[PDB]
Amino acid sequence: HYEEEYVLGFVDKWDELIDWESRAESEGDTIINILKERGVKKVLDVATGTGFNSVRLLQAGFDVVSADGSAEMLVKAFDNARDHGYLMRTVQADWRWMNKDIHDKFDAIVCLGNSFTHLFDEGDRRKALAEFYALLKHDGVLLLDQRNYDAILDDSKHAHYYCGDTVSVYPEHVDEGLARFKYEFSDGSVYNLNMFPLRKDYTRQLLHEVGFQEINTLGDFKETYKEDEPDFFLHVAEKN
Numbered sequence: 549h550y551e552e553e554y555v556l557g558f559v560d561k562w563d564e565l566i567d568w569e570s571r572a573e574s575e576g577d578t579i580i581n582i583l584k585e586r587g588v589k590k591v592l593d594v595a596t597g598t599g600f601n602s603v604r605l606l607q608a609g610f611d612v613v614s615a616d617g618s619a620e621m622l623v624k625a626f627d628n629a630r631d632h633g634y635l636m637r638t639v640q641a642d643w644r645w646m647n648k649d650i651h652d653k654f655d656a657i658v659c660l661g662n663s664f665t666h667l668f669d670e671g672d673r674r675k676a677l678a679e680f681y682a683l684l685k686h687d688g689v690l691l692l693d694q695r696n697y698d699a700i701l702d703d704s705k706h707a708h709y710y711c712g713d714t715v716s717v718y719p720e721h722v723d724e725g726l727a728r729f730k731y732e733f734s735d736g737s738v739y740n741l742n743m744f745p746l747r748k749d750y751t752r753q754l755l756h757e758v759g760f761q762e763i764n765t766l767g768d769f770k771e772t773y774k775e776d777e778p779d780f781f782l783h784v785a786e787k788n
């Protein structure tokens with residue numbers, strides 16, 4: 549399908565122009581510190597994409613399993629990990645039936661980079677979250693992030709820049725059921741992507757409803773030109 553090829557061209561452009569060193573600088577050590585404070589050892593990355601989170605976790609000394617629905621993403625991830633000197637452990641798996649080919653439990657799951665937003669159906673969202681919940685040990689934790697869509701839905705119509713001015717993200721269309729963003733890179737490349745605009749409190753409610761006992765949502769200012777509102781939220785959901 550063209551949609552797969554389209555997104556694959558997008559992540560290629562992302563990796564081409566945005567240095568992982570730069571990105572690791574920008575992103576804090578916050579997520580690594582959060583996991584370390586919990587004595588986390590086994591981590592499942594369910595949204596590996598081209599591997600940045602996974603490689604960051606492997607470099608930090610965690611045991612990581614790197615899952616993704618896309619076999620093509622996983623190939624890019626494995627080779628990126630290899631280039632940074634790490635053996636990735638890859639598994640192709642759909643969020644809606646994660647325990648199909650993953651037969652262990654984890655101290656933590658990470659679903660980062662605004663990934664969960666790609667589900668357009670509520671039944672799918674519940675399913676994905678229940679699967680994640682079952683893959684966690686009793687005292688395990690889910691780290692799940694998302695863009696701040698609340699800021700857009702209530703006001704906000706301007707570009708957001710990342711890694712300096714290397715890429716800008718502009719909301720072309722946003723209603724309660726659909727956000728379409730234009731991504732423009734420094735070399736002229738333009739990509740347009742659809743996602744579901746999760747309200748902060750709606751994600752929190754979903755996590756609560758599938759069984760998560762305690763949820764802390766952090767504001768995360770990732771963009772180059774900071775505003776009063778964070779452009780991202782990070783949900784820290786404890787199974788207990």
Ligand SMILES: C[S@@+](CC[C@H](N)C(=O)[O-])C[C@H]1O[C@@H](n2cnc3c(N)ncnc32)[C@H](O)[C@@H]1O
Nearest residue numbers: 595596597600616617618621642643660661663
């Ligand atoms: C936005 S990328 C995130 C990449 C990485 N976490 C990062 O921050 O660089 C989201 C990934 O989620 C995967 N994905 C989307 N829906 C999925 C699903 N239902 N099951 C498994 N993977 C899915 C896609 O293949 C894609 O690689």
